[PDB]
Amino acid sequence: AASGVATNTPTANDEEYITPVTIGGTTLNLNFDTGSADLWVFSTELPASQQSGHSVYNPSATGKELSGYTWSISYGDGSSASGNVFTDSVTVGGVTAHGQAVQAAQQISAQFQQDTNNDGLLGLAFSSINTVQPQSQTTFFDTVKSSLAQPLFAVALKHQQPGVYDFGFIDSSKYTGSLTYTGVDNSQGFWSFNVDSYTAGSQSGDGFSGIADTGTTLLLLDDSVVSQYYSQVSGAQQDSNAGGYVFDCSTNLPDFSVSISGYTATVPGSLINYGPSGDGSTCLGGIQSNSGIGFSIFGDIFLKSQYVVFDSDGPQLGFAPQA
């Protein structure tokens, strides 16, 4: 049976996490994304100027076209990418997926044109929302999961330290105490779970649903919850140059917790200071608005507090405080 450890590294301020992936013998640095289901890469089909600063996939060297197949994906922040499809050998953490669909980029939006930190994305959401047309393809995980010792993966994302993606096994040294599991709703292709209640510092409220999303930087919550949280942060104000609510970097931030099948998942206030806001001299908050979508995005700010098991049996999510 197979298993492996893929090492992730955060970019500056932990904006995204990058993990090396070998595709047909070329290693690319990809953004592992439990919020989407596409494995797409910068490729030799992009204009040369857009290849600069990246490792790129050359499908002609090792890939096998999926004849007449295309892909086009659009993400929450407005970014997008599109192209055509080849199958190839894809190795993550020493685990090789043979005949894995690799989505070669022909077009990339401005955001990807300005991010030289990654060479594309490796989706880890359910394969049902893979965007390949006319028939969707399986993610790296779904391709290999019956070959793994257990059909799961697990993630430790850290603040300014390398972390792990564990494929096919649970590393019990990555958390304190025992895991608490909660059922997953995969009906929209996400690792969606329910929280029974929340605590935003000195205030608490009713539950909601959200998705475990390694591809999103922040913890995105309902505006009511954001407002409740920052009402407790002295001098907090919206700064559109920075991305949302900002505050003095020396601020002692309240904790944020959620109730998950009787387990309290707590994000310490220290992790809710995302980093210098950029423009001037404030820091950006790790909690921000979900734009009114009616569910929450449990992005990297939250994940840095937990070890999280993504188990296809169920499916279910397992949580415990990171160690």
Ligand SMILES: COC(=O)[C@H](Cc1ccccc1)OP(=O)(O)[C@H](CC(C)C)NC(=O)[C@H](CC(N)=O)NC(=O)[C@@H](NC(=O)CC(C)C)C(C)C
């Ligand atoms: C259709 O699904 C997706 O796009 C999923 C899930 C989602 C659900 C509901 C709403 C938004 C997103 O998002 P994702 O995690 O695959 C996707 C991947 C990214 C590389 C583009 N992330 C995002 O779109 C999110 C925003 C979001 N959720 O609306 N993007 C980010 O967090 C971006 N972060 C910043 O700009 C940093 C700044 C916030 C300090 C990104 C560069 C990583």
Ligand SMILES: *[C@H]1O[C@H](CO)[C@@H](O)[C@H](O)[C@@H]1O
């Ligand atoms: C993950 O699990 C497999 C199966 O036991 C091992 O072979 C591998 O070394 C790693 O521990």
Ligand SMILES: *[C@H]1O[C@H](CO)[C@H](O)[C@H](O)[C@@H]1O
């Ligand atoms: C990724 O790298 C880190 C340290 O180099 C981990 O220890 C893993 O085993 C992977 O090799």
